[PDB]
């Protein structure tokens, strides 16, 4: 058995496709997938409740081995009617918009703070929401703007229900990490599953 | 300060739009929205941590007043390339399909069991997943089929990345409940917001 805990973007928008391909070739090797925020993953790995974790924030622990797995682009986005949805925008313009943020313990929250919000003037947090789908829909209906993985909003961007916002910074790139306990021995079955995770 | 706790279908797909219409008419009156599962909502109401809760399953407590708030259609869905997406299916074919289901004890699993799975001869669960978004991605990539609120799959049905299964069953309707503690009184500030939570 392979027991996995994954962060929100990874567990909801990546690993189900990987598991589908894996189960097709190994239909009699079970997999358990739990999804939470990156802090949830860390604690599950530290408690030896899962075999492997996947996180999307800089989570640190002397008891954890972290290995780079995938790149991931964070995207500032807004309702299509927002003035920010068209043309160049400045950091001061971003700081004047209502921001919708994830909860403490989200890797996305921490990375967005370092890569972007740390460079903004005083800005208002309009709402704090505990998952990325509530944020997507709050932004779609004009409650504010936010910043999430392109993977989370890709389908809305294509359908025109959300709009990407230009940011005067380099592409907001982060690493999606594979983690396991420093004292954990990875099974051959798991290492085989990780081959399906490799792009 | 109105403090809401809502299950995922309601908090992610219904209330964001409602809060928008409300804050547009009451910008000075704030709203705090927490999203989780129905059981999280129940405990938050019991612990007096929120003013009102919204749930999507038959959960019951003797300390709670529950009122039917909205009806909600459950829909069986599959990858567009699935044979089960092409024409009417039999109960036998549904019973043989790989089911992607929410965990036992959740409101969605209980109501899906009652309205759908209890009518199938000896179905098998291909995988258990803890939230609707992971389920959608799993089904989208062919891991199996599932049953969720039409509201939750609407965008993907429109995009054509998920397909509705033509099942030989009645239209499957569940209840979305509004709840509060039985000794709580709905303030006029909250009753006004609830007028915006009125179809
Ligand atoms: Cl019910």
CSV table of N, CA and C in Angstrom, one decimal, chain A residues 62-120:
chain,number,residue,atom,x,y,z
A,62,UNK,N,14.1,19.5,10.5
A,62,UNK,CA,15.3,18.7,10.5
A,62,UNK,C,15.0,17.2,10.3
A,63,UNK,N,13.7,16.8,10.6
A,63,UNK,CA,13.3,15.4,10.5
A,63,UNK,C,12.8,15.1,9.1
A,64,UNK,N,12.8,16.0,8.1
A,64,UNK,CA,12.1,15.8,6.9
A,64,UNK,C,13.2,15.9,5.7
A,65,UNK,N,13.1,15.0,4.8
A,65,UNK,CA,13.9,15.1,3.5
A,65,UNK,C,13.0,15.7,2.5
A,66,UNK,N,13.4,16.8,1.8
A,66,UNK,CA,12.6,17.5,0.8
A,66,UNK,C,13.3,17.4,-0.5
A,67,UNK,N,12.6,17.0,-1.6
A,67,UNK,CA,13.3,16.8,-2.9
A,67,UNK,C,12.4,17.6,-3.9
A,68,UNK,N,13.1,18.3,-4.8
A,68,UNK,CA,12.3,19.1,-5.8
A,68,UNK,C,11.7,18.1,-6.8
A,69,UNK,N,10.4,18.4,-7.1
A,69,UNK,CA,9.6,17.5,-8.0
A,69,UNK,C,9.1,18.2,-9.2
A,70,UNK,N,8.3,19.3,-9.1
A,70,UNK,CA,7.8,20.0,-10.3
A,70,UNK,C,7.9,21.5,-10.0
A,71,UNK,N,8.0,22.2,-11.1
A,71,UNK,CA,7.9,23.7,-11.1
A,71,UNK,C,6.4,24.0,-11.1
A,72,UNK,N,6.0,25.2,-10.6
A,72,UNK,CA,4.7,25.7,-10.5
A,72,UNK,C,4.7,27.2,-10.6
A,73,UNK,N,3.8,27.7,-11.4
A,73,UNK,CA,3.7,29.2,-11.6
A,73,UNK,C,2.5,29.7,-10.8
A,74,UNK,N,2.7,30.7,-9.9
A,74,UNK,CA,1.6,31.4,-9.3
A,74,UNK,C,1.2,32.6,-10.1
A,75,UNK,N,-0.1,32.8,-10.2
A,75,UNK,CA,-0.7,33.8,-11.1
A,75,UNK,C,-1.6,34.7,-10.3
A,76,UNK,N,-1.4,36.0,-10.4
A,76,UNK,CA,-2.4,37.0,-9.9
A,76,UNK,C,-3.5,37.1,-10.9
A,77,UNK,N,-4.8,37.0,-10.4
A,77,UNK,CA,-5.9,37.0,-11.2
A,77,UNK,C,-7.1,37.8,-10.6
A,78,UNK,N,-8.0,38.1,-11.5
A,78,UNK,CA,-9.1,39.0,-11.1
A,78,UNK,C,-10.3,38.7,-11.9
A,79,UNK,N,-11.5,39.2,-11.5
A,79,UNK,CA,-12.6,39.2,-12.4
A,79,UNK,C,-12.3,39.8,-13.7
A,80,UNK,N,-12.9,39.4,-14.8
A,80,UNK,CA,-12.6,40.0,-16.1
A,80,UNK,C,-13.0,41.4,-16.2
A,81,UNK,N,-13.9,41.9,-15.4
A,81,UNK,CA,-14.3,43.3,-15.4
A,81,UNK,C,-13.4,44.2,-14.6
A,82,UNK,N,-12.4,43.6,-13.8
A,82,UNK,CA,-11.6,44.4,-13.0
A,82,UNK,C,-10.7,45.3,-13.9
A,83,UNK,N,-10.4,46.5,-13.4
A,83,UNK,CA,-9.5,47.4,-14.1
A,83,UNK,C,-8.1,46.7,-14.3
A,84,UNK,N,-7.7,45.9,-13.3
A,84,UNK,CA,-6.4,45.2,-13.3
A,84,UNK,C,-6.3,44.1,-14.3
A,85,UNK,N,-7.4,43.7,-14.9
A,85,UNK,CA,-7.4,42.6,-15.9
A,85,UNK,C,-6.9,43.0,-17.3
A,86,UNK,N,-6.6,44.3,-17.5
A,86,UNK,CA,-6.1,44.7,-18.8
A,86,UNK,C,-5.0,45.7,-18.6
A,87,UNK,N,-3.9,45.6,-19.4
A,87,UNK,CA,-2.8,46.5,-19.4
A,87,UNK,C,-1.9,46.4,-18.2
A,88,UNK,N,-0.8,47.1,-18.3
A,88,UNK,CA,0.2,47.0,-17.2
A,88,UNK,C,-0.4,47.5,-15.9
A,89,UNK,N,0.0,46.9,-14.8
A,89,UNK,CA,-0.3,47.3,-13.4
A,89,UNK,C,0.9,47.5,-12.6
A,90,UNK,N,0.9,48.4,-11.6
A,90,UNK,CA,2.0,48.6,-10.7
A,90,UNK,C,1.8,47.9,-9.4
A,91,UNK,N,2.9,47.8,-8.6
A,91,UNK,CA,2.7,47.2,-7.3
A,91,UNK,C,1.8,48.0,-6.4
A,92,UNK,N,1.8,49.4,-6.6
A,92,UNK,CA,0.9,50.2,-5.8
A,92,UNK,C,-0.5,50.0,-6.2
A,93,UNK,N,-0.8,49.7,-7.5
A,93,UNK,CA,-2.2,49.4,-7.9
A,93,UNK,C,-2.6,48.1,-7.2
A,94,UNK,N,-1.7,47.1,-7.2
A,94,UNK,CA,-2.0,45.8,-6.5
A,94,UNK,C,-2.3,46.0,-5.1
A,95,UNK,N,-1.5,46.9,-4.4
A,95,UNK,CA,-1.7,47.1,-3.0
A,95,UNK,C,-3.0,47.8,-2.7
A,96,UNK,N,-3.6,48.5,-3.7
A,96,UNK,CA,-4.9,49.2,-3.5
A,96,UNK,C,-6.1,48.3,-3.7
A,97,UNK,N,-5.9,47.0,-4.2
A,97,UNK,CA,-7.0,46.1,-4.4
A,97,UNK,C,-7.3,45.3,-3.2
A,98,UNK,N,-8.6,44.8,-3.1
A,98,UNK,CA,-8.9,43.9,-2.0
A,98,UNK,C,-8.3,42.5,-2.2
A,99,UNK,N,-7.5,42.0,-1.3
A,99,UNK,CA,-6.8,40.8,-1.4
A,99,UNK,C,-7.6,39.7,-0.7
A,100,UNK,N,-7.7,38.5,-1.4
A,100,UNK,CA,-8.3,37.3,-0.8
A,100,UNK,C,-7.1,36.3,-0.6
A,101,UNK,N,-6.9,35.8,0.6
A,101,UNK,CA,-5.7,35.0,0.9
A,101,UNK,C,-6.1,33.7,1.5
A,102,UNK,N,-5.2,32.7,1.4
A,102,UNK,CA,-5.4,31.4,2.0
A,102,UNK,C,-5.0,31.5,3.5
A,103,UNK,N,-5.3,30.4,4.2
A,103,UNK,CA,-5.1,30.4,5.7
A,103,UNK,C,-3.6,30.1,6.0
A,104,UNK,N,-3.3,30.5,7.3
A,104,UNK,CA,-2.0,30.1,7.9
A,104,UNK,C,-1.9,28.6,7.8
A,105,UNK,N,-0.7,28.1,7.4
A,105,UNK,CA,-0.4,26.7,7.2
A,105,UNK,C,-0.5,26.3,5.7
A,106,UNK,N,-1.0,27.2,4.8
A,106,UNK,CA,-1.0,27.0,3.4
A,106,UNK,C,0.4,27.4,2.9
A,107,UNK,N,1.0,26.4,2.1
A,107,UNK,CA,2.2,26.8,1.4
A,107,UNK,C,2.1,27.9,0.4
A,108,UNK,N,0.9,27.9,-0.3
A,108,UNK,CA,0.6,29.0,-1.2
A,108,UNK,C,0.6,30.3,-0.5
A,109,UNK,N,0.0,30.4,0.6
A,109,UNK,CA,0.0,31.7,1.4
A,109,UNK,C,1.5,32.2,1.7
A,110,UNK,N,2.3,31.3,2.1
A,110,UNK,CA,3.7,31.7,2.5
A,110,UNK,C,4.5,32.1,1.2
A,111,UNK,N,4.3,31.4,0.1
A,111,UNK,CA,5.1,31.7,-1.1
A,111,UNK,C,4.6,33.0,-1.7
A,112,UNK,N,3.3,33.2,-1.7
A,112,UNK,CA,2.7,34.4,-2.2
A,112,UNK,C,3.2,35.6,-1.4
A,113,UNK,N,3.3,35.4,-0.1
A,113,UNK,CA,3.8,36.5,0.8
A,113,UNK,C,5.2,36.9,0.4
A,114,UNK,N,6.1,35.9,0.3
A,114,UNK,CA,7.5,36.2,0.0
A,114,UNK,C,7.6,36.8,-1.4
A,115,UNK,N,7.1,36.1,-2.4
A,115,UNK,CA,7.3,36.5,-3.8
A,115,UNK,C,6.6,37.8,-4.2
A,116,UNK,N,5.5,38.1,-3.6
A,116,UNK,CA,4.7,39.2,-4.0
A,116,UNK,C,4.3,40.2,-2.9
A,117,UNK,N,3.6,39.7,-1.9
A,117,UNK,CA,3.0,40.6,-1.0
A,117,UNK,C,4.0,41.4,-0.2
A,118,UNK,N,5.2,40.7,0.1
A,118,UNK,CA,6.2,41.4,0.8
A,118,UNK,C,6.7,42.6,0.1
A,119,UNK,N,6.4,42.8,-1.2
A,119,UNK,CA,6.9,43.9,-2.0
A,119,UNK,C,5.7,44.9,-2.2
A,120,UNK,N,4.6,44.7,-1.6
A,120,UNK,CA,3.5,45.6,-1.8
A,120,UNK,C,3.4,46.6,-0.7
